[PDB]
Amino acid sequence: GPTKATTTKLVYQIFDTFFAEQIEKDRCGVCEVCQQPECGKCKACKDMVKFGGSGRSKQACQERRCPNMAMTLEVGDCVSVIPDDSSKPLYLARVTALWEDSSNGQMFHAHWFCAGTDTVLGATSDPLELFLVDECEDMQLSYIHSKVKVIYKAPSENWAMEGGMGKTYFYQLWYDQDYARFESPPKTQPKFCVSCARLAEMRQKEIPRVLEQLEDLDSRVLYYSATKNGILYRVGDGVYLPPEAFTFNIKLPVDEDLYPEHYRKYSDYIKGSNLDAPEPYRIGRIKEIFCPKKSNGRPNETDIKIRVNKFYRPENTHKSTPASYHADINLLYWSDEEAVVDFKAVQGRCTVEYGEDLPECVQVYSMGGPNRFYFLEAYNAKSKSFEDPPNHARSLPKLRTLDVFSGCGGLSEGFHQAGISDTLWAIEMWDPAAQAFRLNNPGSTVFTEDCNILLKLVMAGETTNSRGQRLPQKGDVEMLCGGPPCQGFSGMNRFNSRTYSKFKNSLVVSFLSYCDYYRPRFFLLENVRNFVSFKRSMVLKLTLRCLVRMGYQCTFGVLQAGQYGVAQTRRRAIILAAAPGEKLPLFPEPLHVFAPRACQLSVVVDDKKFVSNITRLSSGPFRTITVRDTMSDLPEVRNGASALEISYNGEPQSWFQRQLRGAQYQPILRDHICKDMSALVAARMRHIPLAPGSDWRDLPNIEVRLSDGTMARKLRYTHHDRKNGRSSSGALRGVCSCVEAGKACDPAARQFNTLIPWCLPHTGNRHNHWAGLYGRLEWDGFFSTTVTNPEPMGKQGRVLHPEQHRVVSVRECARSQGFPDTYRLFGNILDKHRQVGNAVPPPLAKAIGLEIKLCMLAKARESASAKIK
DNA sequence: ACTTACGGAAGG
DNA sequence: CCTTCCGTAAGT
Ligand SMILES: Nc1ncnc2c1ncn2[C@@H]1O[C@H](CSCC[C@H](N)C(=O)O)[C@@H](O)[C@H]1O
Ligand SMILES: [Zn+2]
Ligand SMILES: [Zn+2]
Ligand SMILES: [Zn+2]
Ligand SMILES: [Zn+2]
């Protein structure tokens, strides 16, 4: 069975009543009733201090009875402000100024606090915690109800060792409401409202301004540089532009008885289709920044314009989008075509280098930093040719990381190639995943052990495990990464209310107890997207509450993995936490353009929408990775492949394949092995057409001679489906007595050995017609979310090869996840598929790791600048 | 060990 | 109304 969650007392007292039967024991507060705010109307609410009462009586609100219970004024001090309607609680403010405004009366400047019940924490927060917000306004002194004592609960100097342990308002963190960020209080140097200073610094970062005038002309004036959103651009720099900023000179009835299920295809929406993905950014080289002169004879310093030399992508030339198949993802062509755009349109700065002018090689230059492009040739669109460009065209220590619920190590691998971490410890109960981690991380300690048992060992002074493996003590772990089991949070689990999924979900508590005990600098929790909305977003709320209770800067978000370099839709919830002395990391900007339907990443918690700090919504520097970029070089293999190590009959064909294979010649291809489906499943896969969007619904209703001694029989429609109606020939469409609403199934309408699987028309009407089951991938599209078992009749069943009559291999699944072709998997084909489908795609972990590297560099620079004072 | 039959909430 | 998609019990 499953063990109970090991807890510190801090985490226990928060997750107490939620996992009442799952955490090891030694007003529930979490029900839907205990989560709504106080009413404000009743004589109970108007007697607690939040609404301007006495408070001598407790008298809980008369809507929050849990169904699980038994039954002078001087600047610098904080005050209460009563709003119009009394049902909203007292607004807590700080006095930043106390001027006497003539003609208006006594006045002051209120810098607002945010109560904990007004944040993403909701009712989970304690009624005394406050949060700093950039919210101020001038109010009359007629509004002060009373003077409030507010304390600044700072983290101690031994905060990193406080894992394991009145009635005045306190605060520790600043709150950003748009992104639900909890950060340290901003160090702002001196009225002096802090919110006013921060908003004034923000408003003078929004405004683009030209700098260092270059040459004065009659109708305009050139400038050498400009600045926008804190980014400085000069003449000759590369700029990102929206795909609409300029243009290129290159001119851009079935047989319903043969196919009785084809009628269920009436949406025309194709899973994994890239026909609606946007174009990547336009790339320009700034030839001149200029401002037009007003009628007064001097420049308009707000109408900043830039002239730009256009760059072509290989898919922008006359040739075709096939030109993008083998080309580099950051390869361009120089053009002598120019375009004038506005400075407000620029989406960022890039680097466009002439290829054979570089001191490095273009392969080492391309991996050096972000936004790096190169070109070798100039494109002539009027003659549709390529020449060489003209002359005016040329010219920290690693964190010590503990990975809990490691698996095969996709998150650790992504963090390792980001250069930020050194995974020294891994906890992985499942033995094949632990062996894969040992094969991919020869210098780590993998604990093949339950995380609860190991945490209970380390919270006592045991210092070593049974096999004699040195456990990590507090002080060893600078980074704690992990993805706890998602099986109880997934939207595919239809038994998520049973003890199995309860004990799956209780491992988030174990992970948070690791975070509490070890107090690392950085903490990463990864889960499926449904982690943020499971059980009314209460697990997310309680996790963020635990984090802010420890004293952590924390933030949550959702990231689409395909926006970072994989041909796969995979939306994942990410929780980032930083110790009080750190910078809270930002989530990474999308690198590749991805299908807009796969990019819904906002999170609604308690009827409030939270986004991430991401700004790249539509476009991006790079083009989408496709199925052909992923597996167009893997040789032909058959259903039920068993040969582990085979040959690469050829070289890589796309940029993605060169990235995943490398440059050193390795003619060994491992794990291009497919599941061995039965004869009926094989005949079904044989009869799925090759056209895109093909799935079980264009199966033929014929009898087929299987490979074994069996004839797959014909599906019979024995009942009338009053919702689907009848076919053109008058044939029925129901397969069980369930089709008549208000009737039970019949244990005689179940039909076996059919080419069309009976269960799919049986329950298709309430399951989106099982769209995608026995579905093929298209070469121009992307994968669907790679799960631990590619099953053509699974909930995610779009796993058929584009051309071959089989299921995607282990190599193709690892490539849809962004795993290097040298990454080691272990066990039988099911173990390998499970390792691959459980992992975090290494490109996503690499983007997040670079965002953590930013904060590590920032802290190091701040230490240096405070050391040479 | 293998194969199938398949609930319901959230977000657009 | 349609689409999502780290999968689970139960049968065999
Ligand atoms: N109680 C527990 N103790 C230790 N490991 C556990 C566990 N429960 C589940 N696991 C492991 O957690 C793993 C899933 S997380 C593994 C994938 C990881 N996100 C990655 O990027 O590679 C599974 O392999 C499972 O064996
Ligand atoms: Zn009340
Ligand atoms: Zn309750
Ligand atoms: Zn102010
Ligand atoms: Zn039925």
A485 pocket-lining for ligand 1 (C-beta < 6 Å): yes
Q: Is the CB of A608 under 7 A from strand B?
A: no
Residue A181 lies in a domain: yes
Q: Which positions of A make up the binding site for Zn(2+)? A: 28, 31, 34, 39, 42, 45, 61, 66
What does the H/E/C string look like for A116-158?
HHHCCCHHHCCCCEEEEEEEEEEEEHHHEEEEECEEECCCCCC
Q: A159 CB contacts (<8 Å, ≥6 apart)? A: A519, A551, A579, A580
CA–C1' A34–C10 (A): 37
Same domain, A136 and A217: no
| Nearest CA among A713, A607, A672 for reference residue A806 | A672
Please report, for residues A263, A754, A782, the alpha-carbon distance to residue A751 in angstroms, rounded to integers and kept in the order given: 21, 7, 34
Residue holding tokens 């795993």?
Answer: A819
Half-sphere exposure of A713 (CA within 13 A, CB side): 8
Residue A39 lies in a domain: no
**Which of the nucleotides lies closest to A496 (Cα–C1')?**
C8
Torsion sign (Cα): A491, A495, A500, A505: positive
Residue A434 lies in a domain: no
Q: Which ligand ends up closest to the CA of A506?
A: 1
A814 pocket-lining for ligand 1 (C-beta < 6 Å): no
Q: Identify the CATH number of the domain in which residue A138 sits.
A: 2.30.30.490
Question: Which one of A481, A838, A840, A846 would you pick to mutate in the ligand 1 pocket, going by the greatest count of ligand atoms within 8 A of its CB?
Answer: A838
Round to whole Å and give the CA distance between A334 and A374. 9
What does the H/E/C string look like for A37-101?
CCCCCCCCHHHCHHHCCCCCCCCCCCCCCCCCCCCCCCCCCEEEECCCCCCCCCEEEEEEECCEE
Same domain, A97 and A125: yes
Which positions on strand C lie below 7 Å from a protein C-beta?
2-9
Residue A368 lies in a domain: yes
Structurally, chain A folds into a number of domains equal to: 2
Round to whole Å and give the CA distance between A449 and A430. 8
**Which of the nucleotides lies closest to A773 (Cα–C1')?**
C5
Q: Is the CB of A759 under 7 A from strand B?
A: yes
Same domain, A86 and A113: yes
Q: Which ligand ends up closest to the CA of A48?
A: 2
Same domain, A129 and A232: no
Amino acid at A323: A
Round to whole Å and give the CA distance between A446 and A171. 39
What does the H/E/C string look like for A643-692?
CCEEECCCCCCCHHHHHHHCCCCCCEEECCCCCCCCHHHHHHHHCCCCCC
Same domain, A212 and A313: yes
Round to whole Å and give the CA distance between A578 and A412. 18
Last residue of a domain, one of A327, A360, A387: A387
A447 pocket-lining for ligand 1 (C-beta < 6 Å): no
Same domain, A219 and A291: yes
Q: Tokens representing A97?
A: 């100024």
Domain membership of residue A306 as a residue range: 207-243+278-387
Sequence-ordered strand ranges (E) for A488-602: 522-528, 553-560, 571-578
Residue A92 lies in a domain: yes
A528 pocket-lining for ligand 1 (C-beta < 6 Å): no
Residue A113 lies in a domain: yes
Same domain, A138 and A184: yes
Please confirm, yes or no, whether A486 is among the known catalytic residues. yes
Q: Note the resolution in Å, 1 decimal.
A: 2.5
Question: Which one of A406, A417, A486 would you pick to mutate in the ligand 1 pocket, going by the greatest count of ligand atoms within 8 A of its CB?
Answer: A406
Q: For residues A558 and A180, is the Cβ–Cβ distance under 8 A?
A: no
A799 pocket-lining for ligand 1 (C-beta < 6 Å): no
Same domain, A184 and A232: no
A823 pocket-lining for ligand 1 (C-beta < 6 Å): no
Nearest CA to ligand 1 atom 10: A405
Same domain, A303 and A368: yes
Phi, psi of A850, rounded to the nearest 5 degrees:
-65, -40
Please report, for residues A7, A11, A172, A516, A720, the alpha-carbon distance to residue A164 in angstroms, rounded to integers and kept in the order given: 9, 10, 20, 8, 65
Same domain, A88 and A124: yes
Nearest CA to ligand 1 atom 18: A839
**Which of the nucleotides lies closest to A759 (Cα–C1')?**
B5
Residue A324 lies in a domain: yes
CA of A96 to the centre of ligand 4 (A): 7
What does the H/E/C string look like for A840-851?
CCHHHHHHHHHH
How many whole angstroms from its chain centre is CA A713?
Answer: 45
Round to whole Å and give the CA distance between A54 and A342. 60
Same domain, A235 and A369: yes
Residue A289 lies in a domain: yes
Half-sphere exposure of A13 (CA within 13 A, CB side): 10
Same domain, A213 and A284: yes
| Nearest CA among A377, A248, A368 for reference residue A316 | A248
Round to whole Å and give the CA distance between A77 and A96. 8
Please report, for residues A105, A418, A442, A681, the alpha-carbon distance to residue A686 in angstroms, rounded to integers and kept in the order given: 84, 43, 43, 9
Last residue of a domain, one of A344, A369, A387: A387
Q: Is the CB of A771 under 7 A from strand C?
A: yes
Task: Give the determination technique.
Answer: cryo-EM
* Secondary structure (3-state) at A205: helix
CA–C1' A782–B10 (A): 24
Q: For residues A731 and A759, is the Cβ–Cβ distance under 8 A?
A: no
